[PDB]
Amino acid sequence: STPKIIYTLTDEAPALATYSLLPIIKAFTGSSGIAVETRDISLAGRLIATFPEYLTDTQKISDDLAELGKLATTPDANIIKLPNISASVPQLKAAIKELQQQGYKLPDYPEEPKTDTEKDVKARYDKIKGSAVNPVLREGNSDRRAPLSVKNYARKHPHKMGAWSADSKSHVAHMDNGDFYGSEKAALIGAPGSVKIELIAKDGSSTVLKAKTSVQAGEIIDSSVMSKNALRNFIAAEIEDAKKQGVLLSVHLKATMMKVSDPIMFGQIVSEFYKDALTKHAEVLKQIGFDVNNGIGDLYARIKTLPEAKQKEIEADIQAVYAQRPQLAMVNSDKGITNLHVPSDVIVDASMPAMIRDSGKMWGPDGKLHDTKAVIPDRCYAGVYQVVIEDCKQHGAFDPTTMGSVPNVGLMAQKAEEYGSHDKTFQIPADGVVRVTDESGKLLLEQSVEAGDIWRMCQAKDAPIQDWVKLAVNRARATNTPAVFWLDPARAHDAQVIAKVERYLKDYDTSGLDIRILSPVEATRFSLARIREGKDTISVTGNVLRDYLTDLFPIMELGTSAKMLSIVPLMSGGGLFETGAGGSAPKHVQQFLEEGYLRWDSLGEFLALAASLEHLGNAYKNPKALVLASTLDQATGKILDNNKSPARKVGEIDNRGSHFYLALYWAQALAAQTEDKELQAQFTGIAKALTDNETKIVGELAAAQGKPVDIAGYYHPNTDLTSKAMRPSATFNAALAPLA
Numbered sequence: 001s002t003p004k005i006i007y008t009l010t011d012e013a014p015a016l017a018t019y020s021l022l023p024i025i026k027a028f029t030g031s032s033g034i035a036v037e038t039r040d041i042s043l044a045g046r047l048i049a050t051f052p053e054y055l056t057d058t059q060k061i062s063d064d065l066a067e068l069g070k071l072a073t074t075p076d077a078n079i080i081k082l083p084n085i086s087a088s089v090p091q092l093k094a095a096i097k098e099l100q101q102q103g104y105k106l107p108d109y110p111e112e113p114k115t116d117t118e119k120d121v122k123a124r125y126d127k128i129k130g131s132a133v134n135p136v137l138r139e140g141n142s143d144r145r146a147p148l149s150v151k152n153y154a155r156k157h158p159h160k161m162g163a164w165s166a167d168s169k170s171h172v173a174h175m176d177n178g179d180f181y182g183s184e185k186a187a188l189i190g191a192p193g194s195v196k197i198e199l200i201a202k203d204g205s206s207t208v209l210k211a212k213t214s215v216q217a218g219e220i221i222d223s224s225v226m227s228k229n230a231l232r233n234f235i236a237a238e239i240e241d242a243k244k245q246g247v248l249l250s251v252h253l254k255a256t257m258m259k260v261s262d263p264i265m266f267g268q269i270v271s272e273f274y275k276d277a278l279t280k281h282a283e284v285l286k287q288i289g290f291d292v293n294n295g296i297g298d299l300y301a302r303i304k305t306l307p308e309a310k311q312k313e314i315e316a317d318i319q320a321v322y323a324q325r326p327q328l329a330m331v332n333s334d335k336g337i338t339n340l341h342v343p344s345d346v347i348v349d350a351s352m353p354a355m356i357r358d359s360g361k362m363w364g365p366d367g368k369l370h371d372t373k374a375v376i377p378d379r380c381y382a383g384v385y386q387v388v389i390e391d392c393k394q395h396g397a398f399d400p401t402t403m404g405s406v407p408n409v410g411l412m413a414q415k416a417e418e419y420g421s422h423d424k425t426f427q428i429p430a431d432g433v434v435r436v437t438d439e440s441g442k443l444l445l446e447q448s449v450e451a452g453d454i455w456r457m458c459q460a461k462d463a464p465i466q467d468w469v470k471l472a473v474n475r476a477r478a479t480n481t482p483a484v485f486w487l488d489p490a491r492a493h494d495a496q497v498i499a500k501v502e503r504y505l506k507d508y509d510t511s512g513l514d515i516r517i518l519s520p521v522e523a524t525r526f527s528l529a530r531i532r533e534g535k536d537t538i539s540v541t542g543n544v545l546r547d548y549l550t551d552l553f554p555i556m557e558l559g560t561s562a563k564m565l566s567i568v569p570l571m572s573g574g575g576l577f578e579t580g581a582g583g584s585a586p587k588h589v590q591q592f593l594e595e596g597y598l599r600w601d602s603l604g605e606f607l608a609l610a611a612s613l614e615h616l617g618n619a620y621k622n623p624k625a626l627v628l629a630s631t632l633d634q635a636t637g638k639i640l641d642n643n644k645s646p647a648r649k650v651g652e653i654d655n656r657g658s659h660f661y662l663a664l665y666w667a668q669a670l671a672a673q674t675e676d677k678e679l680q681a682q683f684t685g686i687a688k689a690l691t692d693n694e695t696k697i698v699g700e701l702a703a704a705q706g707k708p709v710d711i712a713g714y715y716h717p718n719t720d721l722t723s724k725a726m727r728p729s730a731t732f733n734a735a736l737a738p739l740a
């Protein structure tokens with residue numbers, strides 16, 4: 001019956017931080033009638049939950065991801081979601097190995113299943129790897145923006161911005177035709193039903209690609225195709241031009257999430273770039289099972305089984321290739337790891353803003369920065385980035401001390417658009433035409449295709465879209481800031497969305513508001529003009545642009561996309577608060593294990609918690625929760641103003657130290673506020689204890705630094721050892737003891 005806040009237990013860095021912060025949260029929220037429950041969505045937990053039949057009664061655990069998904073569609077849900085692993089196969093195997101060493105008899109991951117058991121096992125493991133969590137929890141749209149506190153702090157403490165030259169040779173390179181953008185076709189579903197996706201080959205034959213896909217009334221579905229011939233010709237031409245202009249060739253895709261389309265596109269780029277070597281050694285590469293879609297790094301891993309004489313020859317022919325091609329942007333120049341080694345190394349949402357901020361440059365083989373030709377094949381979003389680059393060439397770097405802000409209202413509920421296209425993406429087996437028909441046999445979408453092409457279909461439902469418009473009007477009204485819908489009338493999909501947006505906007509009183517619809521490129525130019533004059537503009541966009549813009553603007557404005565709000569007003573009425581948009585920082589864990597220092601910044605957790613408390617306070621009419629939220633806002637502001645966030649080496653406060661300061665400031669705020677006497681009385685002694693013991697506590701926390709830390713594991717560490725290491729201050733622990 002007590003109102004609950006679900007706190008996700010995740011992986012690596014945030015997981016460690018949670019052992020320190022969660023106890024604090026529980027202690028501060030207890031007296032206000034709030035309960036905090038955890039749900040395990042860690043890679044290891046999701047693996048264990050999936051194979052109960054291979055486990056002892058005591059090893060089994062509840063399937064918390066499924067539980068959360070159900071919760072996300074309930075009216076009173078209140079979830080705080082921290083960053084987590086979207087596992088690569090290597091991470092998956094590593095986690096499986098660790099668990100087996102711990103006694104969990106999980107089956108091995110079979111990369112090439114040849115038995116009923118292996119096939120069943122691989123299918124299940126495949127649903128666990130990759131971006132498995134977000135699609136389940138995101139049952140609402142996105143309200144992502146940096147808090148005013150963070151913006152104001154950035155304004156006063158400007159981060160470094162690479163200077164821009166009007167002579168910069170950097171730019172985005174995209175196809176002119178033959179891409180998804182140029183072939184998009186859409187249809188508006190009239191009534192409930194389902195569609196069939198079939199390939200009608202030239203040889204007359206027919207192949208069902210996906211027999212059934214349920215569709216709702218008012219749902220928008222669209223098909224598009226990336227032409228293999230056009231992509232290859234585009235790549236070949238850009239390779240030559242990069243070499244001619246003397247710039248680094250870089251590639252910006254979203255391989256981990258766009259698990260079907262992007263690795264294929266990545267592979268086609270790798271194939272054309274290294275064609276002389278790959279063709280020459282075609283037979284032996286097939287023999288060792290080389291998978292070009294997994295990058296050239298896959299070749300280096302698999303050739304280690306061939307005679308040393310062969311490895312030598314192959315590696316030499318690869319070097320001959322590099323001498324004939326333009327230089328590649330590097331992920332790690334010292335180790336010779338290029339942009340083409342691993343598909344998941346360079347991720348477009350973070351890589352493009354990083355490049356734009358750093359003078360439009362990337363690392364070259366020499367370990368220095370150089371201008372670059374950023375390849376983003378498809379035209380749908382490539383233009384947005386080009387506009388930013390041109391803006392910087394003409395106006396110079398952005399000025400964090402005066403620039404405005406561009407928050408985002410994004411459409412993502414129910415795996416909207418590209419995010420739910422994976423099971424409807426197919427590499428075409430043979431020339432023909434793909435047809436999408438409904439149950440009555442009506443032809444909804446028809447696309448001519450060639451063998452090797454990438455065909456895909458996306459879906460966008462009406463309820464998500466109406467809620468998305470509602471959210472946009474809400475934000476515009478709350479901030480009295482102009483809002484712009486980024487929709488391209490030339491795209492069949494966007495055109496269908498525009499029709500809905502124009503209709504739904506009429507469902508609101510927008511009299512004193514400034515709302516408009518512009519194509520992505522026009523929207524970008526409009527927003528950048530306003531941002532440089534210090535004005536704000538709300539970007540209202542689809543799922544992918546939500547992803548891109550919420551990394552892009554925070555990077556320019558704040559120098560980081562790790563300090564902000566990612567509020568998800570669940571369509572069922574609940575609230576989901578994501579603490580961070582990034583990864584779980586494996587490197588932070590490495591430093592912690594090596595020298596007992598955790599540099600993870602929990603600011604996002606503090607921000608999300610305040611939003612969660614406010615949500616609970618309003619939903620349950622709990623006055624104390626609202627006071628807890630207000631005082632936490634103050635404490636978080638002091639963390640920023642008094643510079644109590646983690647440092648980087650050893651000696652200074654780390655993640656644990658920042659949590660102490662949060663507790664200190666929060667308790668002090670609670671003891672001084674005049675809205676709730678019971679909380680004031682209760683936290684007076686707590687504030688005194690933390691205040692009087694600041695030096696002693698900070699010292700005990702610092703004493704836990706400087707030595708190796710062993711928590712008996714990585715993906716599934718011993719909880720007692722981890723808890724001990726993350727809560728080393730007996731004085732701090734004792735100070736919160738009275739809390740109930």
Ligand SMILES: [Mn+2]
Nearest residue numbers: 349547551581
């Ligand atoms: Mn992102």
